[model samples]
Target: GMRGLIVDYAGVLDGTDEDQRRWRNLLAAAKKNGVGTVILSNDPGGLGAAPIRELETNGVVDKVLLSGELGVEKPEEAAFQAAADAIDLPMRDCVLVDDSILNVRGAVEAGLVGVYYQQFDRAVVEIVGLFGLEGEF
Candidate 1:
């Protein structure tokens, strides 16, 4: 199984109520399954700190890295590399989830499995299939 999962900071958990539910499930499942998680994002206002901090303080997201801190934005290979690096996994063993198709493509180009998150439910389905996690969502 892939040992790492990378999530986008914008427009992923910022969607509907169902979206939030799916994400919280996935986040908790990832932790329990021993899958390292990294939140990789491009940021403008405060560099996605508030939500990341909230998720961490409230015990959801594990770790986060932003473009503001990396000095490189998504769709660049460096951004994806940073994510894999933070999660302590090689790019091939990491999965990237994002609402941005461009960012997902960049992760693929950088050798990580990429999941474009247009629907949170489908994203959860794919994750369970790939990682074989047992959970209710």
Candidate 2:
């Protein structure tokens, strides 16, 4: 079966200093479960890029989808399509993690499992929830 992770570039990827690379720690397990990753985002510079290039260059992610660069923004099928296409998964095979339900619902509308999270921590729980991951919590 096809399975993929469509993540956001905001707090998840472009974190404040202390939180850098924290997402890697959180998704390490998910990464091993045969899930491919595509980070989708709109343009918002806080960290000069190129280093951001290392996410994929360093194998932190499989693909990067940026709207401003692509002329496609989220909540649009094209946006999600960019991700799924990059990861080579169908819409149904992907799950999107976006902070806004407005954005989240669009992915769901396109047939992806959508997680509405205001914070990355909650997004992590919601992602695990989607897969029914339990560790005797």
Candidate 3:
């Protein structure tokens, strides 16, 4: 079973209402599978806080690590490490999902599994497969 899931916001969760629903469903699934969910974002200040609140309100994420608050952004190793620290997960046990290749590479360099999130369905499927979990949700 998977221990944790770290997600990126912009193109992954905050783009549209449909995308938001997908994020909610994904988080719900993670919860059902007994996996912790953490949201990591690079949006500026309150711009990112709103979506973090939205995700919390919809039960889409358990914890949040915002670059605006952390004063670090993606492609920066510090930001990624801060995220893992915020979630209290070992860097090796964290799975990072992001739409940007640079961000994915950063996660990989940080010793986390980097999943390049494309389509919501594909990302969900790949995650389930990686963890050997039943994709029941």
Candidate 4:
């Protein structure tokens, strides 16, 4: 039902080199599935941009949305609305994957499907089952 996926940056995508491969694999999987991936984060210090640029350089994400630039933060309804508006998509047609429960609730409140990311395997299974996607990356 959704046209793309939006993911939180910090924990979802590693900031260190040790986990770069894992992050790269995840990006590759999303691309392989023909899903447009976007990085949405609350990191206001531009720290989040690095990963976005990395993904862009690697041909992973289709777009990036940083809270700082939008002058908003997660758990705020306006923030989610702004993000949805920026992407030119209906809130109901977007899936927000975040690590915080409050953020998840915010996404839901904004009428978007919220997928909480915990363990990689469990999250993958749950997401695939939710979207009914087959095959593994």
Query: Which candidate leads in TM-score?
Result: 1
Q: How well does candidate 2 match the true structure, expressed as C-alpha RMSD? A: 3.0
- At residue 40, candidate 1 shows an lDDT of 85
> lDDT tens digits, residues 1-137, model 4?
76557778888776466455655665566667665667778877366477566665566777777788878888787777666665577778778888888999889988888889875666666566655556763
Clashes per model (N, Cα, C within 3 A): 0, 0, 0, 0
Instruction: Report the lDDT tens digits of candidate 1 across residue range 20-84.
Output: 87788878888898998888878752634786647756768767777887898898988888888
| Per-model TM-score versus the true fold | 0.89, 0.82, 0.85, 0.79
Clashes of 1: 0
The 0-to-1 C-alpha lDDT of every candidate, in the order given, reads 0.81, 0.75, 0.78, 0.72
Which candidate do you rate higher for TM-score, 3 or 4? 3
Rank list by TM-score: 1, 3, 2, 4
What candidate 2 gets wrong by more than 4 Å, as runs, is 16-22, 44-48, 132-137
Most lDDT-accurate candidate: 1
Estimate candidate 4's alpha-carbon lDDT, on a 0 to 1 scale: 0.72
Candidate 1 residue spans exceeding 4 A from truth: 45-48
Query: Over the stretch 1-137, how does candidate 2's per-residue lDDT look in tens digits?
Result: 44888988775667765455557764565677768888888754235555555677788888777776778899899999989999888989898987768889999999999988676666667777665544411
Residue 26 lDDT (model 4): 59
Q: Which of the two, 1 or 2, has more lDDT?
A: 1
Q: Is candidate 1 or candidate 4 better by lDDT?
A: 1
